[PDB]
């Protein structure tokens, strides 16, 4: 820190959010396609992990900002994953949401009235009106009475919010304290638990297939039973791809926007951004600037970064699946033999699973399969991570360490320092 | 150290004229405080001093294997009689004089000969001072290691102690001001740390700071036009300002964007 | 130009509500240890940057000693903005507060 260099701005607050696939494609300076980091002669190959558009690297001027290694902040690239892959961080909540959904009507298996009640309670909790949330439950007195009940509940919630805002209590950005946070967490836990307890949809009473997550990287959906199949007529095991899950949850989230606006927001959503199921899928990975992926060196011993190894594995799997897609595409215009289609499709499914496992390993080591390279999560979680080892406790300048010896003739408020420390340690005194 | 676990570091090499001197003219080469024995109960050191003085006077060696003495024939009696047959007193004390004042001390001083070992823990292997030096690449913090001119660690248990004093500026000077302080440009509108960059100006222009995220590619859109080394021309993204942050914050933001998490920082003066 | 003026008026009005008037401040009349320490530190930092000095330096070269000398004679031109948890605040000049 230099007291002669004042800073005029200041960070007041931070907020968390999903990095949408559209924005990373715009902020990125270059995407990586070849899983070879640097070609012969040691030069970094363009389009690879070490690209001059991702930052200055080993006495090469950055292609983005034109600055050398000292003054190049670094720039982020991205990987165009061929298929949408599950985000390992959000996989559990995605698996919660996938269950308790009605594939037919594209709603939850819970009735719309109870879901609307929970949405109203959550919206009341957004403004800290925990009192009014339980008073909403005191509104209960076929198919047209429920609409009137919903209208009256919405009117009561709006009246409470408007009165509380006008009655000098709350502003547009809501009141968020610990107790209201505890009540919101309890209500959302009850909501999620209640969703998991259903037999069939309450808007079109047809049973839906029961999913089963064996481990990460794969979701297996059981087939509908014979007796349950009958009801789908009277009312008129299997693997599932990532794209099918994305489509199901995208439809569900588009239908139930009014309810998920209050499950994915603890404060009034002023931006009015819609909650999209794409947020749970990382269609495009983001590579960090090369400044954070530099290779380690000890004389002759030069080793590349582990994150580079993970990204190279991801790129290799991506090229493999792209080749398989091209092989299928050539036969799409002129189909010759379905057996070749059979084997190529089996290879494509294996490629899907392999690339999903690659993403899991790149983000979370413990979610991988087949000691391993630590992921991004493994770099932050425990002691020796990044929060406890480089933020809460850091190493400092202008500090000495030494073995102590006793000394009388010291004023009991003084420390006797050696001449070596007196020669090395310094203080910047502005000349006056 | 001695052979009884009485370890200790040297404090001052006392000049010989300032040391107490005995009636025989000798001055000790080791001073050990009497306040080390009562809580440690190393009476073996007392009796070893007695035996060492007796043996040096008589020019013999005394065996000190355990359980050769009894409660009847105490070693104090044996070595005291040996000392008395040579002139010195029974209890091993000697009349000494303070080397500063020159007067005789209040009582007789317990002095003898004991076997002393020099342990391999010197100070030249343990002292270290860092003003500046090398830094870790991805955190810009001082390196670890005395042999690498690396800084020492102010951990969490010192962080909470600094908080307890109420010394906020001491905490800012240790954890932030002199570990990895940097002034990073932040886009005031997009609120992202690492999405900004410099500009590659024409000959005669001035390189400014611009944001990729909050700018439009000029194809899809002359005082808002800026260019990068690749040549792709952009318009906008000129609302950025400096903020003092740790560099590990930038590294954390990068690793979080690798996870798909976006951190938006709201700067105060907008 | 008009959006910024609305933002400025809103921010200034919200700040004006926060400010507790001079005749309603209910905090302690003494100066806390932290307040005195930061007053001395900030005054010393200012003096180190060629700030005007309102006291006679009896052959002193330590800016912190100059700050202590000014604090003894209550010539420090600073104001403590004590903050309540709500965000409302009170303004006390160093002269009004009494040390220890």
């Amino acid at each position: 820190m230099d007291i002669s260099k004042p800073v005029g701005s200041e960070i007041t607050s931070v907020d968390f959010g999903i990095l949408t696939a559209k924005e990373i494609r715009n902020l990125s300076a270059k995407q990586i396609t070849n899983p070879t980091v640097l070609d012969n002669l040691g030069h970094p190959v363009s389009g690879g992990l070490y690209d001059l558009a991702l930052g200055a690297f080993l006495r090469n001027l950055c292609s983005t900002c034109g600055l050398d290694e000292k003054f190049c902040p670094g720039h982020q690239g991205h990987i165009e994953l061929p298929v949408p892959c599950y985000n390992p961080l959000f996989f559990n909540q995605l698996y919660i949401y996938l269950r308790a959904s009605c594939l037919f009507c594209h709603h939850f298996r819970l009735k719309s009235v109870e879901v609307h009640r929970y949405a109203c309670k959550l919206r009341l909790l957004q403004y800290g009106l925990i009192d009014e949330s339980y008073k909403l439950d005191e509104i209960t007195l076929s198919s047209t009475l429920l609409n009137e009940l919903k209208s009256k509940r919405s009117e009561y919630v709006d009246m409470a919010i408007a009165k509380a805002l006008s009655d000098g209590r709350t502003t547009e950005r809501g009141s968020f304290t610990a107790t209201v946070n505890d009540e919101r967490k309890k209500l959302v836990h009850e909501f999620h638990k209640k969703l998991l307890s259903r037999g069939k949809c309450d808007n079109c009473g047809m049973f839906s297939p029961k999913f089963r997550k064996d481990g990460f990287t794969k979701i297996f959906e059981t087939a509908l039973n014979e007796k349950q199949i009958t009801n789908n007529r009277v009312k008129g095991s299997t693997y599932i791809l990532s794209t099918e899950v994305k489509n199901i949850l995208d439809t569900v989230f588009r239908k139930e926007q009014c309810v998920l606006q209050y499950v994915f927001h603890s404060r009034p959503n002023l931006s009015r951004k819609l909650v999209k199921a794409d947020s749970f899928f990382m269609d495009v990975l983001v590579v960090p600037p090369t400044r954070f992926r530099l290779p380690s060196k000890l004389g002759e011993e030069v080793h590349e970064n582990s994150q580079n190894q993970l990204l190279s594995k991801v790129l290799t799997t991506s090229l493999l699946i792209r080749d398989l897609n091209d092989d299928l595409s050539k036969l799409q215009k002129d189909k010759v033999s379905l057996e070749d289609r059979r084997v190529i499709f089996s290879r494509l499914m294996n490629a899907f699973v392999t690339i999903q496992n690659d993403v899991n390993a790149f983000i979370d080591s413990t979610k991988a399969q087949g000691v391993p390279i630590p992921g991004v999560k493994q770099a932050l979680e425990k002691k020796e991570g990044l929060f406890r080892k480089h933020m809460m406790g850091k190493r400092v300048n202008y500090a000495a360490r030494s073995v102590i010896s006793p000394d009388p003739n010291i004023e009991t408020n003084e420390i006797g320092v050696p001449p070596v420390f007196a020669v090395k340690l310094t203080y910047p005194e502005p000349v006056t | 150290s001695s052979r009884h676990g009485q370890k200790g570091v040297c404090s001052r090499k006392w000049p010989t004229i300032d040391m107490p001197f005995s009636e025989t003219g000798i001055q000790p080469d080791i001073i050990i405080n009497p306040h080390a024995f009562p809580s440690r109960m190393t009476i073996g050191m007392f009796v070893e001093s007695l035996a060492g003085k007796a043996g040096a006077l008589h020019g013999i060696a005394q065996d000190s294997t355990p359980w050769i003495f009894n409660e009847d024939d105490t070693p104090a009696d044996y070595f005291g009689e040996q000392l008395a047959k040579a002139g010195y007193n029974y209890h091993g004390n000697e009349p000494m004089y303070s080397g500063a004042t020159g007067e005789e001390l209040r009582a007789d001083i317990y002095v003898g000969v004991v076997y002393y070992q020099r342990l391999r823990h010197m100070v030249n292997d343990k002292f270290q001072v860092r003003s500046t030096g090398p830094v870790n690449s991805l955190t810009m913090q001082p390196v670890k290691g005395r042999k690498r001119h690396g800084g020492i660690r102010v951990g969490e248990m010192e962080r909470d102690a600094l908080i307890g004093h109420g010394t906020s500026f001491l905490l800012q000077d240790r954890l932030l001001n002199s570990s990895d302080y940097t002034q990073a440009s932040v886009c005031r509108e997009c609120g992202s740390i690492l999405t900004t960059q410099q500009s590659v100006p024409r000959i005669g222009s001035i390189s400014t700071v611009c944001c990729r995220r909050c700018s439009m590619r000029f194809e899809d859109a002359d005082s808002q036009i800026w260019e990068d080394g690749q040549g792709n021309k952009f318009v906008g993204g000129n609302e950025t300002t400096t903020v003092a942050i740790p560099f590990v914050l930038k590294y954390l933001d990068s690793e979080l964007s690798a996870m798909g998490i976006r951190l938006r920082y709201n700067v105060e003066p907008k | 130009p008009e959006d910024f003026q609305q933002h400025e008026q809103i921010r200034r009005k919200t700040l004006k509500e926060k400010a507790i008037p001079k005749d309603q401040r209910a905090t302690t009349p003494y100066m806390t240890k932290y307040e005195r320490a930061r007053i001395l530190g900030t005054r010393a930092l200012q003096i180190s940057m060629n700030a005007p000095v309102f006291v006679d330096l009896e052959g002193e070269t330590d800016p912190l000693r100059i700050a202590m000398k000014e604090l003894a004679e209550k010539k420090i031109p600073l104001v403590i903005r004590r903050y309540l948890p709500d965000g409302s605040f009170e303004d006390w000049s160093v002269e009004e507060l009494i040390v220890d």
Binding site: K5, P6, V7, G8, S9 | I206, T241, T242, P269, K270 | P1, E2, F4, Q5, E8
Partner: peptide
């Protein structure tokens, strides 16, 4: 050059040009 001691941190227009 381009320092907080030289250039304003933020500059906004209050009214329309007149």
């Amino acid at each position: 050059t381009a320092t907080t001691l030289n250039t304003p941190v933020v500059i906004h227009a209050t009214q329309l040009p007149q």
